[PDB]
Curated annotation (Swiss-Prot), chain A:
Described purpose of this protein according to its UniProt entry: Required for growth at high temperatures, probably by acting as a chaperone during heat shock and targeting heat-denatured proteins for degradation by ClpP. Required for biofilm formation. May act as a chaperone regulating CtsR activity.
Keywords, sorted A to Z: ATP-binding, Chaperone, Nucleotide-binding, Repeat, Stress response, Virulence
GO biological process: stress response to cadmium ion; stress response to copper ion
Subunit structure: May interact with ClpP.
Protein residues bound to ATP: 50-57, 362-369
Annotated region described as II, given as residue ranges: 288-473
Every UVR domain range: 234-269
Species per Swiss-Prot/TrEMBL record: Staphylococcus aureus (strain NCTC 8325 / PS 47)
Region (I): 5-227
Molecular functions (GO terms): ATP binding; ATP hydrolysis activity
Protein name per the record: ATP-dependent Clp protease ATP-binding subunit ClpC
Induction statement: By heat shock. Transcriptionally regulated by CtsR. Up-regulated by heavy metals such as Cu(2+) and Cd(2+), but Zn(2+) and Co(2+) have no effect. Forms part of an operon with ctsR, mcsA and mcsB.
Family: Belongs to the ClpA/ClpB family. ClpC subfamily.
């Protein structure tokens, strides 16, 4: 009976034996592993280790409901599992000691900790099920040999891609009887595809079950709107009732009969209208379309509906146009990277290894930063989803212990990539870095996944690794294929030949000509005009002024970087003064024309 | 512009180049010449006179005394 154990902990098996709980499906392997570990004589107290809120606590939930159906083995049969919170517990340890004593000699009750009682677990008398993560298990359970040898290191695996589809199909009818909304077949797969792509902080299985509930509630609320048919009668009924009530207290019964008759007629008409309205709605079924989930998911991360509507069919075909729209110049280096990415998506490249692997050479500010920023927007859909990790200040011995994570005992890249696995990692100035850093980088391109000191394993499948090096820039300043071949020897001389075997292509940036800066200036002018779209301001620059301003601040060493400041100090300085002069111009079209001596800002109207 | 360019390379040599890209403009001050110091003393005298508005005291300093 174990009366002492039941007075200090909550038995989760009794509540789950009623059959009213939801079916915890998808943990096929975890339940079998836990049963095998518990039934064995050695390491009879396995501890569940996994990520927080990814199935670490949901794995033990399904085992309690399987006791009634006798789905466990013979050794694990007729056993009750109690889930006790770690925050419950001299006076504090008395409850734990009483629970351990009443369960050590019995063996029919297994306690749980949300990893004194060390002797009970070491001898296998009492079975303990852990619920901590990998970092806690490797620091407490692995600290002592007796605790480590008596605890099976079980891992709580999360649901697979196809596991969630079956769970959603099985519980599809449950929501139809609650929200009165018919669920189609394509909605389940659309939701399970969108959750695995956009949602990355909750993982499976708790990212898909709650995704369709919001869409069903939204469509239920939208389908019950009144099309200006019921309120127009309800207001009349309310006002007639109020008028009759006012006359009742006024001792005026002459109009009371007429008011009551009118109210009865209005009630009959409202009942007929309600019946005819409810008959039409129930005729058809409100199936959940694929756009409903997209609309709900667009409001959480700001992703436009156009990006969600793409099914990875036309994105590859329009990749070159998107890349060339924001970056103008050196089309050889732009079209080269657009062909090496589509080939890897077919299956020609290992999925674990990163797909994006290119080396950028040349001075900064020529357009490399803009291309790097636009690549993430064109591929993923987010422009700010970039983790820029420089190596300028990583010249110390402890530089390798910073990006890999915080070692146990002390007070970066892994933490940032865990929350946003779909991002582009940039390593600026890779030619000047500590030698210990390259060891971590080699494993990324070779293996594909890393592991920090806390035991968490991070994946780099859908990641792009681009390293920027300054080698080869001095030779160029003193055909694209010939230049790439000539710079390949210089690149291989400086770095290790083994590290360069995982790079697909080498990108070398050339020197922009005079005719290529005019389009960049035009793009900057268009970007400036688009910013002021809320104030309805039309900005146009003539071709004569662009040529004059292009060479005003041209710098061969930097490139187009000083051009931004030149445009800001030339065009915007005069534009701001006119706006600040009591709204001199509003809803007009200002044309900037240069006569060769001074920039005459002509003021016109649209 | 030449002074700003010469100072920018020295500033970016010690710091990170990416951190300086978000800065709008770099402000570099100059030295103080002999003629600039006279107006500083004049401004200080005017501020001191304004400080004594409650007592209505008129303070005037000749140009000979300011230079010394």
């Amino acid at each position: 009976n174990t009366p002492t154990l039941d007075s200090l902990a909550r038995d989760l098996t009794v509540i789950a034996k009623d059959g009213t709980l939801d079916p915890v499906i998808g943990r096929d392997k975890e339940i079998t592993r836990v049963i095998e570990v518990l039934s064995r004589r050695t390491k009879n107290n396995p501890v569940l280790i996994g990520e927080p809120g990814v199935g670490k606590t949901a794995i033990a939930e399904g085992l309690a409901q399987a006791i009634v159906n006798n789905e466990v083995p013979e050794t694990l049969k007729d056993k009750r599992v109690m889930s006790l919170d770690m925050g419950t517990v001299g006076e504090f340890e008395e409850r734990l000691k009483k629970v351990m004593e009443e369960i050590q000699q019995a063996g029919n009750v297994i306690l749980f900790i949300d990893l004194i009682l060390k002797p009970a677990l070491a001898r296998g008398e009492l079975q303990c099920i852990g619920a901590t993560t990998l970092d806690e298990y490797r620091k407490n359970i692995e600290k002592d040999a007796a605790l480590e040898r008596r605890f099976q290191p079980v891992q709580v695996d999360e649901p697979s891609v196809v596991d969630t589809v079956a769970i959603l199909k099985g519980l599809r009818d449950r929501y139809e009887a609650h929200h009165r909304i018919n669920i189609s077949d394509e909605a389940i797969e659309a939701a399970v595809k969108l959750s695995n792509r956009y949602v990355s902080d909750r993982f499976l299985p708790d990212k898909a079950i709650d995704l369709i509930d919001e869409a069903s509630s939204k469509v239920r609320l939208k389908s019950h709107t009144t099309p200006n048919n019921l309120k127009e009668i309800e207001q009349e009924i309310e006002k007639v009732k109020n008028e009759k009530d006012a006359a009742v207290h006024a001792q005026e019964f002459e109009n009371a009969a007429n008011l009551r008759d009118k109210q009865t007629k209005l009630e009959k008409q409202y009942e007929e209208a309600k019946n005819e309205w409810k008959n039409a709605q129930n005729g058809m079924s409100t199936s959940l379309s694929e756009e409903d989930i997209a609309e709900v998911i667009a409001g959480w991360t700001g992703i436009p509906l156009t990006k969600i509507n793409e099914t990875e069919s036309e994105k590859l075909l329009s990749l070159e146009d998107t890349l060339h729209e924001r970056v103008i110049g050196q089309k050889d280096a732009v079209n080269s990277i657009s062909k090496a990415v589509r080939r890897a998506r077919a299956g020609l490249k290992d999925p674990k290894r990163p797909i994006g692997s290119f080396i950028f050479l040349g001075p900064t500010g020529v357009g490399k930063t803009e291309l790097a920023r636009a690549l993430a927007e064109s591929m993923f859909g987010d422009d700010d989803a970039m983790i820029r990790v420089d190596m300028s200040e990583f010249m110390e011995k402890h530089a390798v212990s910073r990006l890999v994570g915080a070692p146990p005992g002390y007070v970066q890249l892994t933490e940032k990539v865990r929350r946003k696995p779909y991002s582009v990692i940039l390593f600026d100035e890779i030619e000047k870095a500590h030698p210990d850093v390259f060891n971590i980088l080699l494993q990324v391109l070779d293996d594909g996944h890393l592991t920090d000191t806390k035991g968490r394993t991070v994946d780099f499948r859908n990641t792009i690794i681009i390293m920027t090096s300054n080698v080869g820039a001095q030779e160029l300043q003193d055909d694209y294929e010939t230049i790439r071949k000539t710079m390949l020897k210089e690149l291989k001389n400086s770095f290790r030949p083994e590290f360069l075997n995982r790079v697909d292509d080498i990108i070398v940036f050339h020197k922009l000509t005079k005719e290529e800066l005019k389009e960049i200036v035009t793009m900057m002018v268009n970007k400036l005009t688009n910013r002021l779209s809320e104030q309805n301001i039309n900005i146009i620059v003539t071709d004569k002024a662009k040529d004059k301003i292009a060479e005003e601040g041209y710098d061969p060493e930097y490139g187009a970087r000083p051009l931004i400041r030149a445009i800001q100090k030339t065009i915007e300085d005069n534009l701001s003064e006119l706006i600040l002069d009591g709204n001199q111009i509003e809803g007009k079209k200002v044309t900037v024309d240069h006569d060769g001596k001074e920039f005459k800002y002509d003021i016109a109207e649209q």
